[PDB]
Amino acid sequence: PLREAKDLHTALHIGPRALSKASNISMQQAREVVQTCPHCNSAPALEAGVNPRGLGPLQIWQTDFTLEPRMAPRSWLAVTVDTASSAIVVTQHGRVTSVAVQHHWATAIAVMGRPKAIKTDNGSCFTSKSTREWMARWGIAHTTGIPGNSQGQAMVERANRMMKDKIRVLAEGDGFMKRIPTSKQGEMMAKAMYALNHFERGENTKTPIQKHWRPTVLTEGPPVKIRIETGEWEKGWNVLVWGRGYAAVKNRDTDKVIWVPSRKVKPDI
Amino acid sequence: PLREAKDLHTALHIGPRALSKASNISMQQAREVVQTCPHCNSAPALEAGVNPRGLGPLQIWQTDFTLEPRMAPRSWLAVTVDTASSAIVVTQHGRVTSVAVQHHWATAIAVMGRPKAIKTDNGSCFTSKSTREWMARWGIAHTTGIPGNSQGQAMVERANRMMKDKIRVLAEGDGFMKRIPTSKQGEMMAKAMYALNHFERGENTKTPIQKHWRPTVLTEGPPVKIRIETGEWEKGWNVLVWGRGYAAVKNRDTDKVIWVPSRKVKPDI
Amino acid sequence: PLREAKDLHTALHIGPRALSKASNISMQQAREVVQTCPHCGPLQIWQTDFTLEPRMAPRSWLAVTVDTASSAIVVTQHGRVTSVAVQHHWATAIAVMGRPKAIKTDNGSCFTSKSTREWMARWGIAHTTGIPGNSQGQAMVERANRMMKDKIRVLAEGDGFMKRIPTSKQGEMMAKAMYALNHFERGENTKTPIQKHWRPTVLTEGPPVKIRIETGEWEKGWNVLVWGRGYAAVKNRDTDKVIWVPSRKVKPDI
Amino acid sequence: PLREAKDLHTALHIGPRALSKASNISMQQAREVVQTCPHCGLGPLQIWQTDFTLEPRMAPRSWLAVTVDTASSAIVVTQHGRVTSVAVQHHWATAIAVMGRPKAIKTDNGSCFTSKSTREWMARWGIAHTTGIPGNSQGQAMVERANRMMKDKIRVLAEGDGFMKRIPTSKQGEMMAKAMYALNHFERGENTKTPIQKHWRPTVLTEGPPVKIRIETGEWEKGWNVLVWGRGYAAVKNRDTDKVIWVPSRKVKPDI
Amino acid sequence: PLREAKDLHTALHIGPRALSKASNISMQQAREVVQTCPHCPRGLGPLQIWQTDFTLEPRMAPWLAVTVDTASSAIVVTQHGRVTSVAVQHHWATAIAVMGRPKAIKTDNGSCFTSKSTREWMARWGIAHTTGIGNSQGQAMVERANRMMKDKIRVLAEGDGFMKRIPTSKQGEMMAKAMYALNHFERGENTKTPIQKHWREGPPVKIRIETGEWEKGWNVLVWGRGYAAVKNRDTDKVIWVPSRKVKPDI
DNA sequence: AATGTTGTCTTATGCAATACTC
DNA sequence: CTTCTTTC
DNA sequence: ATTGCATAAGACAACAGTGCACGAAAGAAGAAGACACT
DNA sequence: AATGTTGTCTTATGCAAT
DNA sequence: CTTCTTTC
DNA sequence: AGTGTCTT
Ligand SMILES: [W+6]
Ligand SMILES: [W+6]
Ligand SMILES: [W+6]
Ligand SMILES: [W+6]
Ligand SMILES: [W+6]
Ligand SMILES: [W+6]
Ligand SMILES: [W+6]
Ligand SMILES: [W+6]
Ligand SMILES: [W+6]
Ligand SMILES: [W+6]
Ligand SMILES: [W+6]
Ligand SMILES: [Zn+2]
Ligand SMILES: [Zn+2]
Ligand SMILES: [Zn+2]
Ligand SMILES: [Zn+2]
Ligand SMILES: [Zn+2]
């Protein structure tokens, strides 16, 4: 049956259940036949990726431009968020230039303070010599991303949800439909980012401004296990941050801290 | 604090968790406040009951065109599947014409038999008076689809993902990567259709041939309950088909048969 | 330390106390650096005032707001003095700091108008007026006016702008000034205006909880440090021993 | 560990990270050791900085030709008696023999760099050359620090072996060599990798295992091999061109 | 590719594997290029055993001293003028700066390496020394370095137009082309460059092959969700196999 | 060089407190 | 006899 | 008595005729001529 | 007039031999 | 001193 | 005045 099944899959590439039933082969073997085939293994998962987040506020920032035509003429919205505090700062601009990046960054620093590093995309206004000189002056490390995959920029584009879903609702509330009047744009914006920092975020236990100015940093965390490349669970780690998607775990022997998917962490003892 | 919370949401449109905590209101009330707001319409009521299925073999067919450049210059693949037996029939054509549709349906009839009804999407070939007058002589019911949002012919469009992949796997297996030579295209077709229809489809207990020529039609099914618009569970129904996604259920008092989502059916007693 | 402080003052013109503390410089030296330059409870009561600024044209009028205890400062540029401008500046102020209790203004028309009046009722803020420019209500707001009217001028001259700041860089001047004032120390106190406002600290541990122990009882004396999927890690306050328990077995203590 | 670290610093005056790693000593101790002693950017092999310095302690061969890799911090120095068009080409030749053939080299406008002979030497090797004043910050500023590094290591080494103001000739070429081994093979500073490991890729992986990558249209394309596979990203090389690109983990799956 | 390969061999006389990889040419052509030119127990560890001997080439008139690593295949030559026991200390001094500190250096017992100055010099570096008891396995290694340096300098100098001798101003300069040709670019039919074996995995593992047998000789490089990438130690071919088909080797 | 995000949306259980049906 | 339009 | 097994979970995935069309912003690449070197 | 669908895909659970 | 390649 | 890197 094993050779007959191999020949059958060679010619027809029959799935494993059919070969297992037809030739009376156990499922592990039939699956082994599909696995050993080069063309039929065209769907392995091989998925991973952590945003990542910072262990404390004013450490990791993310910034990107988004287009909200309601703010016309200055329809470009530069959005920035701290990964630890989840607090949002936004300004309006008419053109996406490095001047707008250093201006917006100047405002966000004027509100929340100076961050350790800002994580942007591969845009031309962020990769300009002038921007590198600006962050060279303010001492902020620069981290770009994949060319076209904003998944790593997730928790800033996630902000672009609120900033665009809150501006819609608040603008419709004051009776503005096609374009927000220029006299009330500042009020709209101020109330907008006012509602998203001093007040909780749905099921969030604290407010983003409280998580900003009064963050929770564990000195030494509780012990956890992590699932390592071979699929095994390894003791000897402690967790410092455990969020919804991902957790930050620290190795006990070195104090190195890494971010891993939640599914790959379980309590140690 | 019902009015205080309402005012807070009026101005800032604060979520229910925040208003419930801030104004000490129970959950149901705060949620009612968010619900009662028009510009915060959640909504999210989109009726999920959606069922494109038929009862018996040769009763309801699905037919659509798709592009696979491996068969060029005749790369146009016409696909027709029987919704009850899941038996696929595909024919290659250089250009999508009503004559090509009548040729395809002529072959699928020459293999499976004359169907009672065929459901397609409203294209140029199907909505022509010529194809209409062709189904006229053969007595086959014609059912078009929504202009653009083709999610109902899915069990044929999904068939393309079942089809074209089995093409590639058979093409790469024979050393043909870019375009399959004209001499072996038809053999590729026959080998694909024989691999799909004459063997189990993954977890399928019967083969499409065993499901077509030896189908299983229940004289009368076991009793079930269905969840009705008000959310209640109503007795007095019997289930005739219970698949992975959807179920066909029959009303005991009238013998009227309707299709409903699996999640909306449970055993009666 | 002397060069770092000099560079810092060149760009932001930070006062001597802040540079002395930040760069570990003795008082006399840091002060000498500031000298060599030629152009050199919280959230209870606020103070608002308008001031002229022809260099910030077209939006020349600047609205300034300051807190009494935290010494914070928020500014907004406007093209003319209107009620919507006052409400905009106040919405930005409460956006950066939060909704206060009382705000002290003057007897001006923009602050005594109707559109400004009814805006106080919805947001719930108290107002106080009196003599047109008295010494107890209009004192510190003028100090802030000196703060901003000096900072914008000196920084704008420091980046190469002399007569009129271009329309693009104006907001950047705003942000740089507010950064030089909020986050930096203009007084002998080691606490910045930002520090004196939010009282920034770090949660060394979690809030107190009770945990259900093997016998089913609920025991006080624990704080929770981690709440993961399914289980929670809780720490005993008297010993710092940490154990993992099911989420269902934890509830807030008091 | 305390004696091993003391001997290592005595001879080479190795920085604290290297001594901490070599003898398994914590950071506070290594830093105390450095204290107790009195005398104490994308891809590599792309841009070099070359300049001359005059160490009077290396006389009569006082002129030192220094070339440091910008993306590796690894340096190559050779002694010369006079700065001419031949000494520069010999130094560049030795450096190329040590750390591989680069593509660009940044120097100043000296006569030894603008001569026709050296120009032809640049042309025959297919290497780029640019001028300068010098005195910039982004470029032309790394070699300046490298010169102080080299003169400092030579000074601390020769003065460590009993030579004060002039190094004996019969030992000159040695007191230079012992410097480079301390500035290339061992880690100098506070980083993790060694300046030699901070050089070339390292050991540019001729072949990786086969992968597919998801291309703009959503398709999965064969013909790539992965050279680096990190948590977020993988480095994959096209087999037909040797072009290497970085892509998200979710867009890669095993081939075959 | 034809011009790139021809130019590369003209200047450096690079072997066929290196030219094939560098210019993406199939092996038959590169071998034809090598043809067209007229003058044209080894797995312990790198940086452990060195062979050093003196062999004279008259083209560098008025000596040469070689030092080769027995694993990385790299070579270092200093071209001394007078053969003394000091030239050995300076030669090894220049070698341990490029190839690093070796764990041992073995030389055939001569009147030059057995001196007390050389022995104290060995002890000063913590490097063990053993006079060669020069072996038959090294007969094809250190002499290989000798004649490979001689022939490489001969072909480079002849290609430059210098028949008998080389100008002393160009002598120290052409030393680099030889080491660069014999160290960076690959030589012979080998796969790894002499550099790629000095600065460079599995547990190892065994893999279950199509016939069901378990084969030793593989190391695993990637273990993802479901599948593993394993590398054959001999050919360096890498294949992906199911997790169930891999187990630790020893 | 540099990784997917949470803010909500409905319905499904487990336990106090009216309002009923004997 | 062109365009013009609705679908795939 | 533990471990080989054919079943769960519990998702990923892509079918929809084809995808590349354009703009902005900042930098890189190619090209015609002026002052210095040859 | 005319309803998002399944075949794989990985890693966790119940019946019988060394 | 214009016209391409990159990315958002 | 070749021609050549440097200017724009
Ligand atoms: W034809
Ligand atoms: W033909
Ligand atoms: W034909
Ligand atoms: W004026
Ligand atoms: W004036
Ligand atoms: W004035
Ligand atoms: W004036
Ligand atoms: W003025
Ligand atoms: W003026
Ligand atoms: W004036
Ligand atoms: W003036
Ligand atoms: Zn197959
Ligand atoms: Zn609302
Ligand atoms: Zn100043
Ligand atoms: Zn020292
Ligand atoms: Zn040759």
**A16 neighbors A31 (Cβ within 8 angstroms):** yes
Query: Which residue do the tokens 């007191």 mark?
Result: D175
D131 touches strand K (CB under 7 A): yes
d(CA E98, CA D183): 11
Which residues does chain A have within 8 Å of residue B170's beta carbon, measured at their own beta carbons?
13
Closest CA to B157 of B67, B242, B218, B220: B67
CB atoms within 10 A of CB A132: 14
Place of tokens 């760069």: C23
Q: Which element (helix H / strand E) includes C236?
A: strand C231-236
- Between residue 27 and residue 66 of chain A, the positions with Cβ below 7 Å from nucleic chain H are 27-28, 43, 45, 47
Calculate the alpha carbon distances from A168 to A236, C21, D157 in Å. Answer: 48, 46, 70
DSSP string, A73-98: TS-EEEEEEETTT--EEEEEESS--H
Q: Among the CATH numbers 3.30.420.10, 2.60.40.1080, 1.10.10.10, 3.40.50.2020, which is that of A60-213?
A: 3.30.420.10
**How far from each other are the two terminal CA atoms of chain B, in whole angstroms?**
47
Closest Cα of chain A to C219: distance in Å? 20
Could you say which residues 207-236 of protein chain B have a Cβ atom less than 7 A away from any atom in strand I?
none
Residue range C45-198 forms a domain whose CATH class is alpha beta
Cα–chain center distance at B234: 26
Question: Which phi and psi (to 5°) does residue B7 adopt?
Answer: -65, -45
Distance CA E148, CA E40 (A): 11
Residues linked to residue D221 through DSSP beta bridges, in sequence order: D213
- Provide the residue type at A53 as one letter: R
**Any strand J atom closer than 7 Å to A10 CB:** no
CB-CB: which of A38, A48, A149 is closest to D231? A48
Options 3.40.50.300, 1.10.10.10, 3.40.50.150, 2.30.30.10; CATH of D210-254: 2.30.30.10
Burial of residue E85 (number of CB atoms within 10 Å: 0-12, 13-18, 19+): middle
- What CA dihedral angle connects C92, C93, C96 and C98, to 10 degrees? -120
Domain range A223-267, CATH class: mainly beta
Q: What is the resolution of this structure in A?
A: 3.8
User: Cα separation of C175 and C73, whole Å?
Assistant: 11
Least Cα separation, residue C126 to chain A (angstroms) = 19
Distance CA D43, CA B66 (A): 46
Q: Give the strands of the sheet with E104-108, arranged side by side.
A: E75-77, E65-69, E49-54, E104-108, E128-132
Scan for tokens 């204290």, then name that residue: D35
Query: What residues pair up with E214 in beta bridges, in sequence order?
Result: E208
Chain A residue with minimal CA distance to C234? A222
- Within 10 Å of residue C215's Cβ, how many Cβ atoms? 6
Contacts of D171 (CB under 8 A, 6+ apart): D161, D163
With beta carbons less than 8 A apart as the criterion, state whether A107 and C173 touch.
Answer: no
CATH number for the domain whose boundaries are B60-211: 3.30.420.10
Size of the D and E interface in Cβ pairs below 8 Å: 86
What whole-number distance in Å separates Cα of residue E9 and Cα of residue E4?
A: 9
* Nearest residue, CB atoms, C204 vs list A194, A219, A247: A219
* Residue spans of beta strands (DSSP E) within B106-245: 117-119, 141-143, 223-227, 233-242
CATH superfamily of E49-181: Ribonuclease H-like superfamily/Ribonuclease H (3.30.420.10)
SS3 for C12-73 is HCCCHHHHHHHCCCCHHHHHHHHHCCCCCCCCCEEEEEEECCHHHCCCCEEEEEEECCCCCE
Can you identify the CATH homologous superfamily of domain E205-248?
A: Integrase, C-terminal domain superfamily, retroviral (2.30.30.10)
C187's tokens = 């007084």
From the Cβ of B64, is strand G under 7 Å away?
Answer: yes
The widest CA-to-CA distance across chain B, in whole angstroms, is: 80
A178 dihedral zone (left: phi>0; alpha: psi -120 to 50; beta) = alpha
**Residue A210: closest CA among C207, C110, C59:** C207
Closest alpha carbon to E74 in E164, E219, E200: E200
Q: Do D97 and E231 touch (CB under 8 A)?
A: no
Backbone angles phi, psi at B87, to 5 degrees: -95, 125
D151, amino acid identity:
K
Our CA-based measurement puts residue E7 at a distance from the nearest CA of chain D, in whole angstroms, of 11
Half-sphere exposure of A193 (CA within 13 A, CB side): 29
Shortest CA distance to A61 belongs to which of A129, A109, A132, A128? A109
Cβ-Cβ contacts under 8 Å for E129 (sequence gap 6 or more): E104, E105, E106, E107, E113, E118, E119, E122
- Strand J atom within 7 Å of A78 CB: no
Tokens 């004359």 correspond to B114
Does B64 count as an annotated binding residue? Answer: yes
Distances (CA, A) of B71 to A42, A84, B77, B185, D222: 21, 54, 8, 7, 21
Q: Helix, strand, or coil here: C168? A: coil
Query: Residue D247: closest CA among chain A residues belongs to which residue?
Result: A146
Per CATH, domain C208-252 is 2.30.30.10 = yes
Asked if A60-213 and A223-267 have one fold, the answer is: no
| Contact call for E227 and A44, based on CB within 8 A | yes
Where would I find the H helices in chain A? 2-12, 16-22, 27-35, 98-112, 129-138, 154-157, 159-173, 182-195, 208-213
Minimum distance, in Å, between the CA of residue D219 and any CA atom of chain A = 11
Binding residues of A for Mg(2+) are: 64, 121, 157
Q: How far apart are CA C101 and CA C88, in angstroms?
A: 18
D90 is in an annotated binding site: no
DSSP per residue over E36-96, as a string? H-S-----S-TTSEEEEEE---GGG----EEEEETTT--EEE---SS--HHHHHHHHHHHH
Q: Are B92 and B71 in contact (CB under 8 A)?
A: yes
Q: Which residues lie below 8 Å from residue B268, measured CB to CB, with a gap of 6+?
A: B222, B223, B224, B225, B235, B237
- Chains with 3 or more CB pairs closer than 8 angstroms to E? A, D
| Separation between the CA of B8 and the C1’ of F20 (whole angstroms) | 39
Q: Which two tokens stand for residue A216?
A: 């929770």
Q: Which residues of A touch E226 (CB under 8 A)?
A: 44-45
Cα gap C251→E143, rounded to integer Å: 80
For tokens 């398994």, name the residue. Answer: D24
Q: Please tell me which residue lies nearest to nucleotide I6, judged from CA to C1'.
A: B158
F14 C1' – A231 CA distance, angstroms? Answer: 38
* Max intra-chain CA distance, chain A: 80
The residue type found at C67 is D
**Nearest nucleotide from residue D130 CA, by C1' atom:** K5
Q: Which residue has the tokens 């710092």?
A: C240
Is E40 within any annotated ligand binding site?
yes
What is the C-alpha separation between D100 and E196, in angstroms, rounded?
Answer: 12
From the list E169, E179, E199, the residue facing D196 with the nearest CB is: E199
Q: How far apart are CA D122 and CA D50, in angstroms?
A: 13
The residues spanned by each domain of chain B are 60-211, 223-267
Name chain A contacts of B169, Cβ cutoff 8 Å.
Answer: 13, 39-40, 42
Which residue has tokens 């080439």? E57
